[PDB]
Amino acid sequence: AAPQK
Amino acid sequence: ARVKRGVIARARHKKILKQAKGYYGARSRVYRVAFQAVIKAGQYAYRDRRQRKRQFRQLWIARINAAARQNGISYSKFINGLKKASVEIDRKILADIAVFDKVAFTALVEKAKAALA
Amino acid sequence: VTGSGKKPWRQKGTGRARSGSIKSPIWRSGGVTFAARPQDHSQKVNKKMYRGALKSILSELVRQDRLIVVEKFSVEAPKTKLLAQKLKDMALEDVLIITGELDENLFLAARNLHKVDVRDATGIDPVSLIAFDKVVMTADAVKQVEEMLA
RNA sequence: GGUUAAGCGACUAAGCGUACACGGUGGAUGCCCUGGCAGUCAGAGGCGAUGAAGGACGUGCUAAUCUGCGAUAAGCGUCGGUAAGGUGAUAUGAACCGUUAUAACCGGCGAUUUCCGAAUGGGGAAACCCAGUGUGUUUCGACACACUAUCAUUAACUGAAUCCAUAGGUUAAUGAGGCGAACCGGGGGAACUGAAACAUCUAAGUACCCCGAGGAAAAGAAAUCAACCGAGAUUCCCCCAGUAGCGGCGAGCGAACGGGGAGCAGCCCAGAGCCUGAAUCAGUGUGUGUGUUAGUGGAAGCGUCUGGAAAGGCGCGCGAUACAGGGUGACAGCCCCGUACACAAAAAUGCACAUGCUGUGAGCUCGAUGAGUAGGGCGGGACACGUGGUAUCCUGUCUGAAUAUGGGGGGACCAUCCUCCAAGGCUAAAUACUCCUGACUGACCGAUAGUGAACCAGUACCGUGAGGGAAAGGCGAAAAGAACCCCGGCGAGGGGAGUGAAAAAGAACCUGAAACCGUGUACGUACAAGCAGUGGGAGCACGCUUAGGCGUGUGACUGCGUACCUUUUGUAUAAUGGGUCAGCGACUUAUAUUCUGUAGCAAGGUUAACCGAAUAGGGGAGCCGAAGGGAAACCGAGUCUUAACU
RNA sequence: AGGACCGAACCGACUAAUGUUGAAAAAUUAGCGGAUGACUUGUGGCUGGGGGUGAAAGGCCAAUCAAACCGGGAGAUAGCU
RNA sequence: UGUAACGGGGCUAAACCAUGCACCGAAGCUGCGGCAGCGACGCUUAUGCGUUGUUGGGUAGGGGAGCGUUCUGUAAGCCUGCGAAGGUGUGCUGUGAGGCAUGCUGGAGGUAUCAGAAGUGCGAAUGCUGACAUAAGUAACGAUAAAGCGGGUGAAAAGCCCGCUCGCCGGAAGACCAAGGGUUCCUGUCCAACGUUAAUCGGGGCAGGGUGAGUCGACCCCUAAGGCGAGGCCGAAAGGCG
RNA sequence: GUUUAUUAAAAACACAGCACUGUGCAAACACGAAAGUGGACGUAUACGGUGUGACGCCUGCCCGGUGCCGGAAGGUUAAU
RNA sequence: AAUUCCUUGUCGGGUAAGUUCCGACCUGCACGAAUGGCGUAAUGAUGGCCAGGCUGUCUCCACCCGAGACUCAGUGAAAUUGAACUCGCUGUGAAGAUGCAGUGUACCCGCGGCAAGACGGAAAGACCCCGUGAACCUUUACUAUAGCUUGACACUGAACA
RNA sequence: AGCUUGACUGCGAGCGUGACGGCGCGAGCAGGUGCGAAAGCAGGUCAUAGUGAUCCGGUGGUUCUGAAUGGAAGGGCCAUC
Ligand SMILES: COC(=O)c1c(OC)cc2cc3c(c(O)c2c1C)C(=O)[C@]1(OC)C(=O)C=C(OC)[C@@H](O)[C@]1(O)C3=O
Ligand SMILES: [K+]
Ligand SMILES: [K+]
Ligand SMILES: [K+]
Ligand SMILES: [K+]
Ligand SMILES: [K+]
Ligand SMILES: [K+]
Ligand SMILES: [K+]
Ligand SMILES: [K+]
Ligand SMILES: [K+]
Ligand SMILES: [K+]
Ligand SMILES: [K+]
Ligand SMILES: [K+]
Ligand SMILES: [K+]
Ligand SMILES: [K+]
Ligand SMILES: [K+]
Ligand SMILES: [K+]
Ligand SMILES: [K+]
Ligand SMILES: [K+]
Ligand SMILES: [K+]
Ligand SMILES: [K+]
Ligand SMILES: [K+]
Ligand SMILES: [K+]
Ligand SMILES: [K+]
Ligand SMILES: [K+]
Ligand SMILES: [K+]
Ligand SMILES: [K+]
Ligand SMILES: [K+]
Ligand SMILES: [K+]
Ligand SMILES: [K+]
Ligand SMILES: [K+]
Ligand SMILES: [K+]
Ligand SMILES: [K+]
Ligand SMILES: [K+]
Ligand SMILES: [K+]
Ligand SMILES: [K+]
Ligand SMILES: [Mg+2]
Ligand SMILES: [Mg+2]
Ligand SMILES: [Mg+2]
Ligand SMILES: [Mg+2]
Ligand SMILES: [Mg+2]
Ligand SMILES: [Mg+2]
Ligand SMILES: [Mg+2]
Ligand SMILES: [Mg+2]
Ligand SMILES: [Mg+2]
Ligand SMILES: [Mg+2]
Ligand SMILES: [Mg+2]
Ligand SMILES: [Mg+2]
Ligand SMILES: [Mg+2]
Ligand SMILES: [Mg+2]
Ligand SMILES: [Mg+2]
Ligand SMILES: [Mg+2]
Ligand SMILES: [Mg+2]
Ligand SMILES: [Mg+2]
Ligand SMILES: [Mg+2]
Ligand SMILES: [Mg+2]
Ligand SMILES: [Mg+2]
Ligand SMILES: [Mg+2]
Ligand SMILES: [Mg+2]
Ligand SMILES: [Mg+2]
Ligand SMILES: [Mg+2]
Ligand SMILES: [Mg+2]
Ligand SMILES: [Mg+2]
Ligand SMILES: [Mg+2]
Ligand SMILES: [Mg+2]
Ligand SMILES: [Mg+2]
Ligand SMILES: [Mg+2]
Ligand SMILES: [Mg+2]
Ligand SMILES: [Mg+2]
Ligand SMILES: [Mg+2]
Ligand SMILES: [Mg+2]
Ligand SMILES: [Mg+2]
Ligand SMILES: [Mg+2]
Ligand SMILES: [Mg+2]
Ligand SMILES: [Mg+2]
Ligand SMILES: [Mg+2]
Ligand SMILES: [Mg+2]
Ligand SMILES: [Mg+2]
Ligand SMILES: [Mg+2]
Ligand SMILES: [Mg+2]
Ligand SMILES: [Mg+2]
Ligand SMILES: [Mg+2]
Ligand SMILES: [Mg+2]
Ligand SMILES: [Mg+2]
Ligand SMILES: [Mg+2]
Ligand SMILES: [Mg+2]
Ligand SMILES: [Mg+2]
Ligand SMILES: [Mg+2]
Ligand SMILES: [Mg+2]
Ligand SMILES: [Mg+2]
Ligand SMILES: [Mg+2]
Ligand SMILES: [Mg+2]
Ligand SMILES: [Mg+2]
Ligand SMILES: [Mg+2]
Ligand SMILES: [Mg+2]
Ligand SMILES: [Mg+2]
Ligand SMILES: [Mg+2]
Ligand SMILES: [Mg+2]
Ligand SMILES: [Mg+2]
Ligand SMILES: [Mg+2]
Ligand SMILES: [Mg+2]
Ligand SMILES: [Mg+2]
Ligand SMILES: [Mg+2]
Ligand SMILES: [Mg+2]
Ligand SMILES: [Mg+2]
Ligand SMILES: [Mg+2]
Ligand SMILES: [Mg+2]
Ligand SMILES: [Mg+2]
Ligand SMILES: [Mg+2]
Ligand SMILES: [Mg+2]
Ligand SMILES: [Mg+2]
Ligand SMILES: [Mg+2]
Ligand SMILES: [Mg+2]
Ligand SMILES: [Mg+2]
Ligand SMILES: [Mg+2]
Ligand SMILES: [Mg+2]
Ligand SMILES: [Mg+2]
Ligand SMILES: [Mg+2]
Ligand SMILES: [Mg+2]
Ligand SMILES: [Mg+2]
Ligand SMILES: [Mg+2]
Ligand SMILES: [Mg+2]
Ligand SMILES: [Mg+2]
Ligand SMILES: [Mg+2]
Ligand SMILES: [Mg+2]
Ligand SMILES: [Mg+2]
Ligand SMILES: [Mg+2]
Ligand SMILES: [Mg+2]
Ligand SMILES: [Mg+2]
Ligand SMILES: [Mg+2]
Ligand SMILES: [Mg+2]
Ligand SMILES: [Mg+2]
Ligand SMILES: [Mg+2]
Ligand SMILES: [Mg+2]
């Protein structure tokens, strides 16, 4: 999981 | 019947790696890289059999121009004179005579001048 | 191939090529892609083509002087040594013996001579006629072959 | 000759590159097979309360594991075979047994056969805990042995409410129970998928669950078909035929009649008399033939050369109903084990009979002829047949005949005709399969293949569990498996010595590739900018020589030159994919149909199943073709259209 | 007396830093909340997959949950790479 | 970001216009040699050769012809211990796939020719298995409770043993148990592997030893939640409930 | 008090209290092809469902639409 | 206003200065009465705002104490990787160049540091679109169906009005 | 404006336009008509839009078929919905 564009 | 590939595979790979001798690094050691190198070298070999013919004619002309001007005429006039004189000595020979037989070249130059005069 | 249908790893996220079975033919110990089955290789030959071919072979054996014809060919006892001498006297080897009726003594005597075969006139075949160097036929056998091939 | 100046300039290699020589690592390739795969011909088709399958724990001169066996424990008795050598394997050793018959080994028949497990005396966390009753011993402390589960059927004795009775209870006898690869019959019964979506339909009565049986099962002796002629139970194969039909008339599904074959078998109860126990078949005693379970004999060769070794080369012999196959120091008909062939069973046993005993009852005459059934209404299902005009079969529900002076069927229905007798039952063969046993075969595999397993593999290991599941073969002819010496830690490892044909075959062992890592030698390389090559090319080193010019290696300098695959209008692309090497890895197979090539026959061509001492021959049942037109009747080199054709 | 107050054991998990190929597939350090109750904990039992359980977050049901795992239908299908 | 609007140097022509003659310039065209396709016509074929004309970039894709691998027949033949297959160099040869000879290694197999059948050809599939690189002799060596010295043993001692100091826990980091594990316990011996280093040490390898009950616990008697359940009731079967 | 084990602890969930509604006991209701079991060894001051959410002052108008409750005349309407 | 778009509405308080906060106005885009309205002591690891105290949060950082980093000895990984002989600039170009063109600079090789670039590494984009893909959820979408409910027939009879 | 039903039945040389299914134009033949004295004209409308395949089912006719035979049902063919 990570911040997505 | 089942057919094992090992003997033929080795023979085919070994053929390519023999042509790659002398190439730097993996190009002479590893089949995947050597194959690309061997094919590219073959392309240059095909191409450069044509350039060879161009490069030498370029070289002969330069030497004829140098020797012609020592005798006081430019290449373009020198060649034109020989055509008028009906001399078919080609540029490969003129570049040879220009180096090894300077007195013979001078006679040719005077023959060209007489046709332009 | 023996092995469960369990998927080896999740479809995504592992960074590894996607796979669906351990039994895939791409894998070591996987199945054979087009695995063989027991099968029948026999072919049809038309009766007229079969009989037409035999006539051609027999005509060449004559034309090549390979066909020998005799009145009688028999041996008094099944002793193999007797047949071996008889053929040596004829200077025969690699010979096919065709007889119109089978003397059981002749059959037994030939059985250990691998360069020799004994056949009843009903049992001729295309390959034996071509494979043996000489063919010996009794006059009775010839007539039975003529009636057979018509 | 000296000094100064100017110009030009080799010898450096910390390391690196290319080539070559020699190694390491690693385990490809070749060769091999005591392991697999698919079959053919036979056998067997079960085991269990007389305690199974599968296990636990024991058992040796025995520390472990395997194999066997069970407190009588790698074994005991007896009958046979056989015997000069034996006491299973890793695996030696120790202590012994035996040699003309009581060593061992092989076969039949017996004995022993712990504990768990249907597990059965009760219980239970499998391999454990706890008893009751009755016999017998006793050393008075206790021992040994047998029996005691449940259900069904039958019998005896008991016995309520309830007088009789019945339900119930106790005891005895007989049977079942559980396991197992496929095949078989029945009860239930999906979805993915196809339909280019999807709901009828398909997949499919498939997968799967449950019940029951046998060596096979099921079916079976016309209330059947046919067509005015006739066939004659059931089952299986080839046609008929991808036809007639069914079908959101879509995708698809798909007969029968009739013909050719394999095999061939018919009977009994619904009932009395006559004649009796004649047919036939079940059990079981005996005998003959034959197969099985151990076996016996089983021919014929030496010289010389190479070699570590002869089975090979060369020379001269011999056997053969035996030249199948395997082994022996390299390839053996004659060295060995076998093979062809001829023989053998004390005992048990599968079949064929013959026959004893028990059970059965054959033949004749008269008579009878399967009712909540056939049929119907309603809802479903099976038939190729989806309710359709739908015959026929089954039945959940409600009804309901006639019964040989009668009923069923012939694809809605009616008439005539034909054909057959439902509502009771039994029955071999042709057919399906292979957990398992024996022999033999392969244009099957050969250690990343063949089984998951060539090896102590359903193991190690992983998961709570159901369950998943590996890797791992090769010294040599023979261990002759390296005495002894030296360095070293009374090491690891190594160097000699010795064995051997070989030790660079040394157990980390046949061959031993590539990636990858080194040591040495020749040349290049520290003022030089990029897909690393290509064309030209000096110099150097090493060899050859026609002696100034050839080969191999390197490559200063110089022209040209932005990897490969994929996908795209277009990629150096800064789009995808690949760290490299070695092994594996993707247009197959079966059956129909059409076209082309080629071969045979030709207005004809060809057989399928099957038979066959079997790639032959037989079998022409069928199929395509030589005639078309029409929806069809029908006509026919014509036909349809139309009243008729120009 | 008290779902009373402060605060250890015990139960929890509000903030920050560290760690993030970790000492650890959810921790440590310094602070933090409850702490006689709708408390906490040992042993045993019961509920099962369109089902359970849920002071309700689609949360939990063996490191897995808008339908667990294992085996089978099964080589489902893939006009896509 | 840096001359950055001739490619650069540079140019007063080395710019522009007009005329003219030379020369350079491509895989175009010509010359010389070789190969192959398609036509036409014949030394004459009998299916190939000769003369001549013309053609020969190529993806998707169509058509034609071949090489090589394993296996079956020819083959009880032929080659091979006077050295096969396989591995590794070299030379020759064909248009190519390839073929042939031979030095070294290896140590028992191979197979002509013509036919027959395919598990018949690999660089890619984030392909599968094994081996070996790179990063790199880099990060890290797991609580900041802490060590120092003398003597011993030993091939070798920061780490082992003994001693004296120092430090740390002390509602535990002490002591005894259950659950779980199953020989880790104690003694002798060894240091290959394991121990994040060395090791003489060890919970490591090897051999031997060690667990003693009328009173502790289990077993046993009695029951909870719950389980099973003769008959029974119910359910297509399997089973459910009691 | 409780909650998203593993990024959200809260204003969300629960709560005592309030209202509507169902249930006369072989209760309604739930799990079960069924037997049976829970509700409950309870009995309307009891039990189930729904909404609101201590306490204080309060909770106004609409029955046209959808739902529920009562009615039965007439129209229509299945098997039969 | 947890609701107000225009909107930092307007006015007042607080500050030198206040898009937040508090009070008030009512033009309520689009509050409102048990999917409750309006108050409310106590309580809360609850949201917002202000003040005292305190302070390295900060102006603006300095020094010190330990553990790493650094050197030496022993042991010894991993992500990644077509191959590399792996410079700047301007242009060109699948349109943002270490590799092309022109041009400038540059002896060969380490060690300690920093991260601007290698459209750096990790994950077959989770946003968007597509597929006659999937799942689960809703309803007066379609077709069914468990359950509930109606009637007829059966089990099911007698007499009378 | 008068008289009428050619808004006919069976065919059709030959063309145009569509991938196809299809769509369009048409002289002339046979039968039987209307107008015109006659030659002649008429197979709807100055032309180009006013429309929907197959399946399924309905209605009328018919010299076809009719599951043993004679019928019938059902099917075919023709017109039309
Ligand atoms: C715009 O927003 C984001 O850029 C963003 C993000 O920005 C901080 C953080 C996350 C974090 C996560 C996820 C995100 O999508 C995500 C996104 C999109 C997930 O979907 C998640 O990924 C394992 C998952 O599988 C299931 C979950 O909840 C159902 C999450 O809890 C999850 O576990 C998670 O950690
Ligand atoms: K050097
Ligand atoms: K090695
Ligand atoms: K044993
Ligand atoms: K049974
Ligand atoms: K379906
Ligand atoms: K589809
Ligand atoms: K769909
Ligand atoms: K029917
Ligand atoms: K009937
Ligand atoms: K192997
Ligand atoms: K394997
Ligand atoms: K060797
Ligand atoms: K090597
Ligand atoms: K160059
Ligand atoms: K690619
Ligand atoms: K693209
Ligand atoms: K990309
Ligand atoms: K792409
Ligand atoms: K074909
Ligand atoms: K408790
Ligand atoms: K589920
Ligand atoms: K060789
Ligand atoms: K690859
Ligand atoms: K390294
Ligand atoms: K050591
Ligand atoms: K909280
Ligand atoms: K909540
Ligand atoms: K509220
Ligand atoms: K209303
Ligand atoms: K209302
Ligand atoms: K009303
Ligand atoms: K609002
Ligand atoms: K709070
Ligand atoms: K960077
Ligand atoms: K008119
Ligand atoms: Mg990836
Ligand atoms: Mg395999
Ligand atoms: Mg035949
Ligand atoms: Mg013979
Ligand atoms: Mg050096
Ligand atoms: Mg070097
Ligand atoms: Mg080597
Ligand atoms: Mg029991
Ligand atoms: Mg018992
Ligand atoms: Mg579909
Ligand atoms: Mg079906
Ligand atoms: Mg039977
Ligand atoms: Mg013997
Ligand atoms: Mg012998
Ligand atoms: Mg040998
Ligand atoms: Mg009858
Ligand atoms: Mg009936
Ligand atoms: Mg039906
Ligand atoms: Mg009838
Ligand atoms: Mg009929
Ligand atoms: Mg091998
Ligand atoms: Mg294997
Ligand atoms: Mg397996
Ligand atoms: Mg385990
Ligand atoms: Mg040694
Ligand atoms: Mg020697
Ligand atoms: Mg050997
Ligand atoms: Mg070796
Ligand atoms: Mg230099
Ligand atoms: Mg310079
Ligand atoms: Mg594009
Ligand atoms: Mg380009
Ligand atoms: Mg790229
Ligand atoms: Mg790049
Ligand atoms: Mg790709
Ligand atoms: Mg990549
Ligand atoms: Mg409290
Ligand atoms: Mg919690
Ligand atoms: Mg804490
Ligand atoms: Mg606290
Ligand atoms: Mg508090
Ligand atoms: Mg407290
Ligand atoms: Mg518990
Ligand atoms: Mg939500
Ligand atoms: Mg979980
Ligand atoms: Mg689902
Ligand atoms: Mg399927
Ligand atoms: Mg698949
Ligand atoms: Mg500037
Ligand atoms: Mg220019
Ligand atoms: Mg010129
Ligand atoms: Mg040129
Ligand atoms: Mg040209
Ligand atoms: Mg050309
Ligand atoms: Mg071409
Ligand atoms: Mg061969
Ligand atoms: Mg040799
Ligand atoms: Mg071979
Ligand atoms: Mg060679
Ligand atoms: Mg292949
Ligand atoms: Mg490869
Ligand atoms: Mg490729
Ligand atoms: Mg690595
Ligand atoms: Mg580094
Ligand atoms: Mg460092
Ligand atoms: Mg460090
Ligand atoms: Mg430590
Ligand atoms: Mg010391
Ligand atoms: Mg220490
Ligand atoms: Mg202290
Ligand atoms: Mg131990
Ligand atoms: Mg100890
Ligand atoms: Mg160590
Ligand atoms: Mg130990
Ligand atoms: Mg005592
Ligand atoms: Mg029970
Ligand atoms: Mg709280
Ligand atoms: Mg959370
Ligand atoms: Mg939190
Ligand atoms: Mg609320
Ligand atoms: Mg109200
Ligand atoms: Mg009502
Ligand atoms: Mg203001
Ligand atoms: Mg305000
Ligand atoms: Mg509101
Ligand atoms: Mg309201
Ligand atoms: Mg308020
Ligand atoms: Mg170091
Ligand atoms: Mg480049
Ligand atoms: Mg260029
Ligand atoms: Mg450049
Ligand atoms: Mg650096
Ligand atoms: Mg940094
Ligand atoms: Mg990236
Ligand atoms: Mg994607
Ligand atoms: Mg589409
Ligand atoms: Mg008009
Ligand atoms: Mg009829």
Side-chain angles (χ1 to χ4, degrees), chain B residues 5 24 29 44 48:
Chain B
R5 300 188 281 123
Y24 174 79
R29 295 176 172 82
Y44 292 142
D48 216 308

Short mmCIF file of all heavy atoms in Angstrom, two decimals, chain B residues 5 24 29 44 48, chain D residues 18 532-533 559 585:
data_model
loop_
_atom_site.label_atom_id
_atom_site.label_comp_id
_atom_site.label_asym_id
_atom_site.label_seq_id
_atom_site.Cartn_x
_atom_site.Cartn_y
_atom_site.Cartn_z
N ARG B 5 18.42 -33.20 -27.26
CA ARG B 5 18.94 -32.09 -28.05
C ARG B 5 20.39 -31.73 -27.75
O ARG B 5 20.96 -30.91 -28.46
CB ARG B 5 18.07 -30.84 -27.83
CG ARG B 5 16.65 -31.06 -28.24
CD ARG B 5 15.77 -29.83 -28.22
NE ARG B 5 15.28 -29.39 -26.92
CZ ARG B 5 15.47 -28.20 -26.38
NH1 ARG B 5 16.24 -27.29 -26.96
NH2 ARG B 5 14.85 -27.89 -25.25
N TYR B 24 35.51 -8.21 -26.98
CA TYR B 24 35.66 -7.84 -25.58
C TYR B 24 34.55 -8.41 -24.72
O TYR B 24 33.38 -8.44 -25.13
CB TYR B 24 35.68 -6.32 -25.45
CG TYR B 24 35.69 -5.85 -24.03
CD1 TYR B 24 36.85 -5.86 -23.28
CD2 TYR B 24 34.53 -5.42 -23.42
CE1 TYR B 24 36.85 -5.43 -21.98
CE2 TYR B 24 34.53 -5.00 -22.12
CZ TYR B 24 35.69 -5.01 -21.41
OH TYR B 24 35.67 -4.59 -20.11
N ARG B 29 32.32 -14.80 -24.84
CA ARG B 29 32.16 -15.79 -23.78
C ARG B 29 30.75 -16.33 -23.67
O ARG B 29 30.58 -17.51 -23.37
CB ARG B 29 32.54 -15.17 -22.44
CG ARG B 29 33.98 -14.79 -22.30
CD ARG B 29 34.18 -14.12 -20.98
NE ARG B 29 35.58 -13.88 -20.68
CZ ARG B 29 36.27 -12.86 -21.13
NH1 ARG B 29 35.74 -11.98 -21.97
NH2 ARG B 29 37.53 -12.70 -20.75
N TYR B 44 28.33 -5.28 -40.95
CA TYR B 44 29.40 -4.36 -41.28
C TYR B 44 30.27 -4.91 -42.40
O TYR B 44 30.72 -4.16 -43.27
CB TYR B 44 30.27 -4.08 -40.06
CG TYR B 44 29.63 -3.32 -38.95
CD1 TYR B 44 29.89 -3.64 -37.64
CD2 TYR B 44 28.77 -2.27 -39.20
CE1 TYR B 44 29.32 -2.95 -36.61
CE2 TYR B 44 28.20 -1.57 -38.18
CZ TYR B 44 28.48 -1.92 -36.88
OH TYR B 44 27.91 -1.23 -35.85
N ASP B 48 30.84 -2.76 -45.73
CA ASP B 48 32.14 -2.17 -45.93
C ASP B 48 32.88 -2.70 -47.15
O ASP B 48 33.89 -2.12 -47.53
CB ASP B 48 32.98 -2.37 -44.68
CG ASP B 48 33.88 -1.20 -44.40
OD1 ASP B 48 34.63 -0.79 -45.30
OD2 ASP B 48 33.81 -0.66 -43.27
P U D 18 39.04 -9.82 -22.64
OP1 U D 18 37.63 -10.01 -22.96
OP2 U D 18 39.62 -10.52 -21.48
"O5'" U D 18 39.89 -10.22 -23.91
"C5'" U D 18 39.43 -9.92 -25.21
"C4'" U D 18 40.49 -10.21 -26.23
"O4'" U D 18 41.70 -9.46 -25.96
"C3'" U D 18 40.97 -11.64 -26.29
"O3'" U D 18 40.04 -12.49 -26.93
"C2'" U D 18 42.29 -11.49 -27.01
"O2'" U D 18 42.10 -11.24 -28.39
"C1'" U D 18 42.82 -10.21 -26.37
N1 U D 18 43.69 -10.45 -25.20
C2 U D 18 45.00 -10.75 -25.42
O2 U D 18 45.47 -10.89 -26.53
N3 U D 18 45.74 -10.94 -24.29
C4 U D 18 45.29 -10.82 -23.01
O4 U D 18 46.06 -11.00 -22.08
C5 U D 18 43.93 -10.48 -22.86
C6 U D 18 43.20 -10.30 -23.94
P A D 532 29.09 -1.92 -32.32
OP1 A D 532 29.08 -0.96 -33.43
OP2 A D 532 28.85 -3.35 -32.57
"O5'" A D 532 30.51 -1.86 -31.64
"C5'" A D 532 30.92 -2.89 -30.74
"C4'" A D 532 32.38 -2.75 -30.40
"O4'" A D 532 32.59 -1.52 -29.67
"C3'" A D 532 32.96 -3.87 -29.54
"O3'" A D 532 34.32 -4.06 -29.88
"C2'" A D 532 32.86 -3.26 -28.15
"O2'" A D 532 33.73 -3.84 -27.19
"C1'" A D 532 33.23 -1.82 -28.45
N9 A D 532 32.81 -0.84 -27.45
C8 A D 532 33.54 0.24 -27.06
N7 A D 532 32.96 0.98 -26.16
C5 A D 532 31.76 0.34 -25.94
C6 A D 532 30.70 0.64 -25.08
N6 A D 532 30.69 1.69 -24.27
N1 A D 532 29.65 -0.19 -25.08
C2 A D 532 29.67 -1.24 -25.90
N3 A D 532 30.61 -1.61 -26.75
C4 A D 532 31.65 -0.78 -26.72
P G D 533 34.98 -5.52 -29.84
OP1 G D 533 34.50 -6.21 -28.64
OP2 G D 533 36.42 -5.39 -30.09
"O5'" G D 533 34.34 -6.26 -31.09
"C5'" G D 533 34.81 -6.04 -32.41
"C4'" G D 533 33.67 -5.86 -33.37
"O4'" G D 533 32.99 -4.62 -33.06
"C3'" G D 533 34.03 -5.76 -34.84
"O3'" G D 533 34.05 -7.03 -35.48
"C2'" G D 533 32.94 -4.86 -35.40
"O2'" G D 533 31.75 -5.60 -35.61
"C1'" G D 533 32.69 -3.92 -34.24
N9 G D 533 33.49 -2.69 -34.27
C8 G D 533 34.47 -2.34 -33.39
N7 G D 533 34.98 -1.17 -33.63
C5 G D 533 34.28 -0.72 -34.72
C6 G D 533 34.39 0.49 -35.43
O6 G D 533 35.16 1.42 -35.22
N1 G D 533 33.50 0.56 -36.48
C2 G D 533 32.60 -0.41 -36.80
N2 G D 533 31.81 -0.16 -37.84
N3 G D 533 32.48 -1.54 -36.15
C4 G D 533 33.34 -1.63 -35.12
P G D 559 38.88 9.44 -38.77
OP1 G D 559 38.52 10.86 -38.92
OP2 G D 559 38.52 8.73 -37.53
"O5'" G D 559 38.24 8.67 -40.00
"C5'" G D 559 38.02 9.32 -41.24
"C4'" G D 559 37.24 8.46 -42.19
"O4'" G D 559 37.90 7.17 -42.34
"C3'" G D 559 35.83 8.09 -41.76
"O3'" G D 559 34.89 9.11 -42.06
"C2'" G D 559 35.58 6.81 -42.52
"O2'" G D 559 35.28 7.07 -43.88
"C1'" G D 559 36.94 6.15 -42.45
N9 G D 559 37.09 5.25 -41.29
C8 G D 559 37.82 5.50 -40.17
N7 G D 559 37.78 4.53 -39.30
C5 G D 559 36.98 3.58 -39.90
C6 G D 559 36.58 2.32 -39.44
O6 G D 559 36.86 1.76 -38.38
N1 G D 559 35.77 1.67 -40.35
C2 G D 559 35.39 2.17 -41.55
N2 G D 559 34.60 1.39 -42.28
N3 G D 559 35.76 3.35 -42.00
C4 G D 559 36.55 4.00 -41.13
P G D 585 11.34 -30.98 -24.43
OP1 G D 585 10.37 -32.02 -24.82
OP2 G D 585 12.44 -30.62 -25.33
"O5'" G D 585 10.51 -29.66 -24.12
"C5'" G D 585 9.32 -29.69 -23.35
"C4'" G D 585 8.72 -28.32 -23.20
"O4'" G D 585 9.62 -27.45 -22.48
"C3'" G D 585 8.43 -27.59 -24.50
"O3'" G D 585 7.17 -27.94 -25.03
"C2'" G D 585 8.53 -26.12 -24.11
"O2'" G D 585 7.33 -25.66 -23.52
"C1'" G D 585 9.61 -26.15 -23.04
N9 G D 585 10.97 -25.87 -23.54
C8 G D 585 11.90 -26.82 -23.82
N7 G D 585 13.02 -26.33 -24.21
C5 G D 585 12.85 -24.97 -24.16
C6 G D 585 13.74 -23.93 -24.47
O6 G D 585 14.90 -24.00 -24.85
N1 G D 585 13.17 -22.70 -24.30
C2 G D 585 11.90 -22.49 -23.88
N2 G D 585 11.54 -21.21 -23.78
N3 G D 585 11.05 -23.45 -23.59
C4 G D 585 11.58 -24.66 -23.75
#
